[PDB]
Amino acid sequence: SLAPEDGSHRPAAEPTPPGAQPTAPGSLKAPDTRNEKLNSLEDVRKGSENYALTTNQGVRIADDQNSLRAGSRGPTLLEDFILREKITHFDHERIPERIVHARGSAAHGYFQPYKSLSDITKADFLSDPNKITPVFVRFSTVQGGAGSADTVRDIRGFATKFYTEEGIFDLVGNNTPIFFIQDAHKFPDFVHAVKPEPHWAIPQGQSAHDTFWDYVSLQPETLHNVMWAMSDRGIPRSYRTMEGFGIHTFRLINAEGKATFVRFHWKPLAGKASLVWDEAQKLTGRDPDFHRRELWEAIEAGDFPEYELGFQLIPEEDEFKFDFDLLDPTKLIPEELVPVQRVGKMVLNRNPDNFFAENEQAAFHPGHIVPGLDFTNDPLLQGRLESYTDTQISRLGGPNFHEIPINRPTCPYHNFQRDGMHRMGIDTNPANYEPNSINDNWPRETPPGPKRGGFESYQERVEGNKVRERSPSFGEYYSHPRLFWLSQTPFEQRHIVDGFSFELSKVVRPYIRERVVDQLAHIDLTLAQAVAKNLGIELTDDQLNITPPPDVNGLKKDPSLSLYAIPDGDVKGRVVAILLNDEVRSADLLAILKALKAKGVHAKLLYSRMGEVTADDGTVLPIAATFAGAPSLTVDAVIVPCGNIADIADNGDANYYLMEAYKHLKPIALAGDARKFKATIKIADQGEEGIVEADSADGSFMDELLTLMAAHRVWSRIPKIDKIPA
Amino acid sequence: SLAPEDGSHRPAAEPTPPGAQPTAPGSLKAPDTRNEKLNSLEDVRKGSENYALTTNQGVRIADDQNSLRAGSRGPTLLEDFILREKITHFDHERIPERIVHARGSAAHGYFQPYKSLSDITKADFLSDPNKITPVFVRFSTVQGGAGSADTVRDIRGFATKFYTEEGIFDLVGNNTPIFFIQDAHKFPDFVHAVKPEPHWAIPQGQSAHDTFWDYVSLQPETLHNVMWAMSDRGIPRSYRTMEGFGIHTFRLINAEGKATFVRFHWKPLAGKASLVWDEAQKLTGRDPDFHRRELWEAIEAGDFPEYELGFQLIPEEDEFKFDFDLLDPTKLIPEELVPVQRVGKMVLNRNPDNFFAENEQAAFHPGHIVPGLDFTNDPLLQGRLESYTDTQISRLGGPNFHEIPINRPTCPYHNFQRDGMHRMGIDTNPANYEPNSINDNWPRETPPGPKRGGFESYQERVEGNKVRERSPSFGEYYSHPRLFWLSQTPFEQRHIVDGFSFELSKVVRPYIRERVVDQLAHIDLTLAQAVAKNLGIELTDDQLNITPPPDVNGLKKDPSLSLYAIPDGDVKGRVVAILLNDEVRSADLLAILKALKAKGVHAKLLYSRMGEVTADDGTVLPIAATFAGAPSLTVDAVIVPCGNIADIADNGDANYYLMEAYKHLKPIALAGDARKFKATIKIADQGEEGIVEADSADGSFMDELLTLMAAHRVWSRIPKIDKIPA
């Protein structure tokens, strides 16, 4: 039962493009990629080659194929300890999934700042451009279970654990700059509303159901983040192509004790890019693991996800100078008002070894801050501090979750805490309390100071009575949704209208749809009317007369809120499908692959069967997947080289591949006789912007294709796609 | 007063068709549907209307919108015990999912036998045709998490908890009559091989990956259940339209002590029906909850799932009379050799009230038998008995899982077991041990007997040495795979070839595909050649010459193994999409809808937007969903009535609706000018079988459509669909 003679069962331990080699554990794929945290896991990494199969007690197993029984057709015997241990371990493999963000995908990397930030913070990880901090990052959806699909419409989580020299800092953020609700007390109400309904546990991975829109209609504070969710921000192309935000205002504290308010940002260096809805929903069926897969394969290819950390900084004295409250997590701070200052770069460059041990058991918590950082009174941040430690006690089995290898600090940790389930550390200290004289009081408290000091909270002034009351300054709900709406391109606005229309059409109780349309009328009449028309609802005269909400500190728009208004495309790490035929013109393929390789764009060679095809010059071309096996949903663009086109001209799947790519606004390039396929997509002898066409695939043909790919999608095609039946 | 004045927020408590009303908890939807188990849950059912909101300690809450803070913009205070309790409960909502069969859907119902089976078993629930036993049934997939999709290719679980007067009996079966493996010792290997791969946790809900086919290629005992998984058995249209089987041979024991060997079957009274692959895969995207939904809605409609329990019975003297071992769970007993005797009927007639409390916490275990049943030495059944109690200790938090309301027997339970986490029962017995005098030895042991006796095991002779050894009688792997193959229709054989070809195409290491193909060549050369051709693999001369395995006791086919060879269609509960236009011929719609209603077939009225359209005669037609919102994947047949066809003739969604339906072999009917859509699907002027067309929807148009629906799909269309780009 052995490995093939040719070694083909084992991936090469070098970077390789997606599909070229089977995927593997990060330490076997990239053994020479290291960082302090990855090295520190070596105490628990376990190999396998050349070792005997044993029980967990170290007893060699002779027959792992059979239970012990009284005769070979007889009853199994109670004394089979080998069977019992193996089955008992299997029986207890599962642990509770995260209450939210159960579905997530993670990787290791490192961070470093561009310059010391000691003027504004004493945080050690921000103190020196040449001090590298290992990180572990998990990206996630919110609503669905661990086994739900990746490319749903949802908010995404973006959690980073920095293993710093002065402690672990977890920056536990999402991919939009606000949240749905103002006070943590409502969190279980909002999450219950979005999650599968309690009677029948439907729907998975979708906000398109009555209870969510019932809560939204009755809680207008939710409308800002609902706008972001209904836009294409809700369906990113990759975790590499979305923004990250800490949402809350936090504090930075410098050595002089000065507090500066801050909001955290991550900028994706691969650019912002999202799917369109029909593509994202069909992709949850064709590959529900698409984002997990794409992230792992990018890292194996060397297309490391990179993000720039940035800070919006507001001096203490400017706390009240905006027309929103800085502590309200449903309000964003527009970059036109407060620019994002670039802080440092994070690069994710190694996949884990074991998903369960490292991803599933990772515990992030926004209370894990370090000296130089502090909280504010944001009432959603405040309540989050009661949750993340608590939930970890059932999910991870008790209070020693920081000893699970992935969660361990790389810096020293010593205290008087003892015992708890699954206690790993064996403490030698004669004392388990302080103050003590029997160990001369060690370990000892450390005064706060400029570097290496103990944690002290900023001495913020508190004055108020003990109340359960929402601050009046939080009671405005329409101006930020409007700012967001007005900052989108026209095609982005169409996509928002379509998201609301699609979701509300799934709400069974029509009055809820009506109540939501009335809320949209308080944001923008054009948005409200367009959603209403799709729902067969007619706005009343009163609704038509609702005064729009005020501008945000005079802003009519802020283009930083759009995915696409400002070009920032990067083609490196994108993928093209190349549709083969049984006599491919090799000069086309040479030019195609050469130009793709120059820009770091991968290719997948597709055909109507697996195996190989031979090109016109005898080159044997291995086939990656069939047209049906790897649909156009999984690539950024489609190229059809010249060759024996009649081979594929009447193939339904090949035609369909182009129809689906066209519908989803992807660039398509057709060389030589492949231009015969123009007829399937109904599109003119003169040509069309978004369709590259020439006699052969040369320098020019490929430059045009790659230019289109840098703009991500062919938005100008949108009016043409409603008539195509795909 | 947030409810609408008109009361439209609340579903009517009467049966209603899918989509007509919002779905609800079973006890509110169908309060008059009762059984002894449903009544016994009354002690824990909790209402809500007219009651004050409280903490779990009973304290009325005043403000459930805010945390307590020092000033309305100030920090949250540790003393907020109301916040703390609410967030703590939320923080601990999740429990571990089942290790396998985590994705499942459940309902309540009842079973009654047709006649007393006292001559062959003393089981009380089978003793009297007027004896009604409540059941709770959970249907499931195997591989995916609780948040994975329903219409994946997989085996399905079919677990029935019978709440009998002599104890709980759990019949824990699947929808194929064999399992992949022979000995329980291999269960963690096989499950690990099918489950997502451990480095990256991909793929979800799919066996289409290297490790699964690696294990299959190395363990030919798996090939029989692999054949069933690759056939359309692996993609049922509904839980109502698949078979059930206990798989193992068990025993029935009568009052005279005679043992009869038995295998258990469930026959779906709705008939057998499956999807086709492209449809199933796309449906995991458009509605991952499709089976859960369709089951819930069938019960809300009164289309109760009904199944007939049947037994294959083999006398003890005939144990060795077959070419296969009766104790081998990779072998089926052909119904040609051993007919299924009809035993009784089960009807599922009420949904749960709360999915988590009743479905997620339900615990089934095949060791839960009752007097009149017993085990055999089947080595897979034997090892199951060590797993199911064990896994419930972590999944359900301890040894008192039988006190979770859904799992409680309805009959008396008394013993000397005490304590354990979560103990609910407060024992008053002075004694907690036996034998005791202090409570006169109560509760007391009961001798075995004809009725109401204690459990005693059948005194089977055991003779052999203590060995971990597979019986030689189990070492035959290809004859049952071949009997299955030869028993399928030609279109079912095509779908089997396509299943293997699609799955192996996703295996990244080509040598694994080649090894699987070599295994296929040991089953049937035509099968092997067809799969090899789709993989670009050429059989060797040695492969072309392998001799086929022998017939199974002289059979070269058994038609009961086919889903479709023997017509068993039932249209009640099925659904048709009706594609509206803005001036529908109202006489067509009256004819269509009343014809459907007469046969219990549901309809969904679809259009390009929500709201209403108006028919030729002013009739107002309410729209259920848009064409994109309720795709053809979700229906069994498509009817386009006459009207203003121009309204929808150039709508890409409307056209594609028909293309998709056509490709997936569904009946389509076109009335009047709707026949203009014939060009979209390339139908000839003189028409074709499976397309119903007339000048109007009158006369025999609806009878013809309904005849096509009773045969499920238009298999003769398969050669046509190849070309179509959809």
Ligand code: HEM
């Ligand atoms: C701005 C608002 C919030 C953001 C950006 C946020 C972000 C996230 C992210 C990204 C994760 C997943 C971390 C991972 O990958 O493991 C998560 C987990 C979680 N969050 Fe939040 N969250 C927010 C609000 C809240 C609130 C208000 C609460 C409760 C008061 C809460 C409770 C939790 C819990 C219980 C988990 C599961 C954590 C675990 O099991 O380890 N979240 N959150």
Ligand code: HEM
């Ligand atoms: C003929 C072969 C088998 C059949 C028909 C079968 C059927 C099933 C079904 C239908 C369920 C889901 C019950 C529900 O809906 O909750 C399940 C659960 C389970 N099965 Fe099996 N199974 C088989 C083999 C085995 C084997 C060999 C083992 C281990 C020795 C095993 C261990 C388990 C475990 C751990 C669960 C989760 C049960 C729970 O958490 O309550 N199964 N099985």
